[PDB]
């Protein structure tokens, strides 16, 4: 089927020039036109072009500038904070509706810094819940697992907040008492940024 | 141009009962060929949008009967018959009748259910945390209903309200509850100087606050 394939972050200091590809499959690329949509985390959904005869959307008219051919690129120019946001890729023809996964781009002079992970343990209950402190990482875009993924059913992911410059967040899974300590758990924290991966085994 | 606004901006509604959201245009929807290009997607969160249904009425591949579109010209409605946890996230609505294509500003629904008490979890500072300088006092309040919660922060029974943060968490697809953790932060001196280290949650199932503490 149509798939869509869209790096998954980009980091660049502003001012400079950025240039996203989406590499489509599944179709012949050559029956449907690329659209391109950017959303900045408040909601908001915008549309900027489409394409190598390119139709624009004249707010978008100096910032983006369509490429193709496999492959559709999208390079936006003199980037500003205001240029952060998550950018799409999409056939949005009627019937025919696909979306990339989309690509988020943090423009910042911000230097990349890997988390640190401390183990959150605590006693009494019929399930007993633990959690991991993921904090000072830069850019967002992390990612907490726990046993490898396979523990999903109690798992409460909370949202990064910027604490002093760096982003700060927490992860908690509840398991019956029974199994813990009696089983360990870890967490697996993963910040592609920086290629960090680091394991927490939970002890008490 | 042509503004699309939706209506309401947040729909709370129980399992099982009809939704309705609105979206209305600053323009005729209707092409000069005669079709509305009027479409609804429905974007979960950490997801791209997904298309529910195109030109008013017609389902894509996939999308259930629950889900109906209505209207003509300026004025259109999304239905959802029997609300199911499944169905929560931001209902967008679409035009591209007119060049550029302008999307609307979203409909949270959000689903109504019966009162939860959060279940509080209070945990002190590890040692690899302690050993770089830093305590980090944390706190989890999970599986509450409704998103309305009050924390606070008493360091031997005098409250902090410096240095801490707090995340919520969107409702849980799973059983429609919130969550949030609240985090205080302190050096590894300021902490050793302290003996309780209390959260309290105000919460409307209670007219008592939900405490929890461990000592030093
Ligand atoms: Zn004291």
């Known amino acids: 089927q149509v798939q869509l394939q869209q790096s998954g972050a980009e980091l660049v200091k502003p001012g400079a020039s950025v240039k996203l590809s989406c590499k489509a499959s599944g179709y012949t690329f050559t029956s449907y036109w690329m659209q391109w949509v950017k959303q900045r985390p408040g909601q908001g959904l915008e549309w900027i072009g489409e394409?190598?005869?390119?139709n624009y959307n004249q707010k978008f008219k100096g910032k983006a500038t369509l490429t193709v051919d496999s492959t559709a690129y999208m390079q936006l120019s003199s980037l500003t904070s205001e240029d952060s946001a998550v950018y799409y890729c999409?056939?949005?023809?009627?019937?025919?509706?696909?979306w990339g996964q989309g690509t988020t781009l943090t423009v910042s002079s911000a230097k990349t810094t890997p988390p640190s992970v401390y183990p959150l343990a605590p006693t009494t209950g019929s399930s007993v819940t633990l959690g991991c402190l993921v904090k000072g990482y830069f850019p967002e875009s992390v990612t907490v697992t726990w046993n490898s993924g396979s523990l999903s059913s109690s798992v409460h992911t909370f949202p990064a907040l910027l604490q002093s410059g760096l982003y700060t967040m927490s992860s908690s899974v509840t398991v019956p008492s029974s199994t813990w300590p009696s089983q360990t758990v870890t967490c697996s924290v993963a910040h592609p940024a920086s290629s960090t991966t680091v394991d927490k085994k939970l002890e008490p | 141009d042509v503004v699309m606004t939706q209506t309401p901006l947040s729909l709370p509604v129980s399992l099982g009962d009809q939704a309705s959201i609105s979206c209305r245009s600053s323009?005729?929807?209707?092409?000069?060929?005669?079709?509305?290009?009027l479409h609804w997607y429905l974007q979960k969160p950490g997801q791209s949008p997904k298309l529910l249904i195109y030109?008013?009425?017609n389902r894509f591949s996939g999308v259930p009967d629950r889900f109906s579109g209505s209207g003509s010209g300026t004025d259109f409605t999304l239905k959802i018959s029997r609300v199911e946890a499944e169905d929560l996230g931001v209902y967008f609505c679409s035009q591209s009748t007119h060049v550029p294509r302008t999307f609307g500003g979203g409909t949270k629904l959000e689903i109504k259910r019966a009162d939860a008490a959060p279940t509080v979890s209070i945990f002190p500072p590890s040692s690899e945390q302690l050993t770089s300088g830093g305590a980090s006092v944390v706190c989890f309040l999970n599986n509450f209903y409704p998103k309305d919660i009050n924390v606070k922060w008493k360091i031997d029974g005098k409250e902090r309200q410096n240095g801490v943060l707090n995340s919520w968490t969107d409702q849980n697809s799973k059983d429609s509850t919130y969550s949030m953790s609240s985090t205080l932060t302190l050096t590894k001196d300021e902490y050793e100087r302290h003996n309780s280290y209390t959260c309290e949650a105000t919460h409307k199932t209670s007219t008592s606050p939900i405490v929890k503490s461990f000592n030093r």
């Open positions: 030109k008013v009425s």
């Open positions: 323009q005729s929807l209707v092409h000069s060929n005669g079709n509305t290009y």
């Open positions: 394409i190598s005869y390119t």
């Open positions: 999409a056939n949005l023809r009627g019937y025919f509706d696909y």
